[PDB]
């Protein structure tokens, strides 16, 4: 829960994840990566299921880091999708997508995938607006000047109805060689009407111009028992356009 | 290397992988899963980089299991994409995609993703033919009556030229409810002309009819040093059509 997630987490690479869980399902914090084109802290935002099922399954959650701070710009964003498991050896088991901004020629090679285990020991104008994917889903987002993404997601498919809060990050200083703009965001599939004990992260890049698009891959993690943890995470791809 | 890979491997779930690596980059064997809708042995086929680099990096490889045998049909296929790392604690580090045959309505929810670590210590007619993806790549495949897939792959993109061998598996007895047919295959990016020290696995489903498709997700693993292992694997999606 909130008390369970809030705190400092360490992964198998030596990265440090500092997070506060809000009563409302918010995740806010800083990420410090021991590997890659990274240095010092980066802002992270995400969501978690603030009312997980009480059958001993984990708590679905997700979060995004855009790899830009005052010192470094790696023209990339990672999203982690996973579940928090509580108790004496508390864990956040995740899968992650790392998208780099690329030319359209290199887009097929844009996205790394991996797994991280966390333990408690050891432009703006372009993106802001309404987007529509091939499923009929609607993504309403405001890009902040500081790399924030905030808005609501409405899915035409799955155990979803009405709007869900979304938070994420984008590279607010993309390279100006015609590369896309790396970004990601999370929805926890809980609102006032439904709780699907799950969270999706989208990792992708915004491409501008006459046919602007946001090309993404996503991870959907469900809260599971440890028995079913191997079958907790769906993967897919969504293409968003500004026209339905 | 061939000698390093050949043998019995065990993962964190208690599954057993028995494999023979051929001198030609072939992987053949049986998989026994400790979890899921699986019992007894299932055929596996795949490929590996038979000429990895000698800078200490792992050896790219992948393989497929279609979850059909004489006792069980789970209308699914898993592809593992990873690298073999040799020495005293030999490992195969993988990511996997498990695609289930679904209706078009449920296709968005068809594919699971995970990671497995292995240690040495504990529609035949529809599919057969030429397929083209959105990148301009060409996939030529023969589906065997037994769930085999064999053929060649020619990629319009990446560190690739001419044909590469492909092997894989499909559900040779999907359900009679309009679901797609689960399948997967592997290409190791080595031929007589090029070695890209990498292997791709496609996991997906064949949908038949007037606009037949193979909808896939893929994992591309490069051989890396242990320091670069975190950045070894690309993920994407390819749609293949007959046109």
From Swiss-Prot, chain A:
Natural source organism: Streptomyces avidinii
Organismal lineage: Bacteria, Bacillati, Actinomycetota, Actinomycetes, Kitasatosporales
Position of sequence motif Cell attachment site: 47-171
Subcellular location(s) of the protein: Secreted
Disulfide bonds: none
GO MF entries: biotin binding
Subunit structure: Homotetramer.
Alphabetic keyword roster: Biotin, Secreted, Signal
Entry keyword Ribonucleoprotein: no
Family named by the database record: Belongs to the avidin/streptavidin family.
Top-level taxon of origin: Bacteria
Assigned GO CC terms: extracellular region
Avidin-like domain ranges (all copies): 3-244
Residue numbers binding biotin: 31, 42, 80, 96, 108, 153, 164, 202, 218, 230
Coiled coil: none
Name of the protein this chain belongs to: Streptavidin
General function of this protein: The biological function of streptavidin is not known. Forms a strong non-covalent specific complex with biotin (one molecule of biotin per subunit of streptavidin).
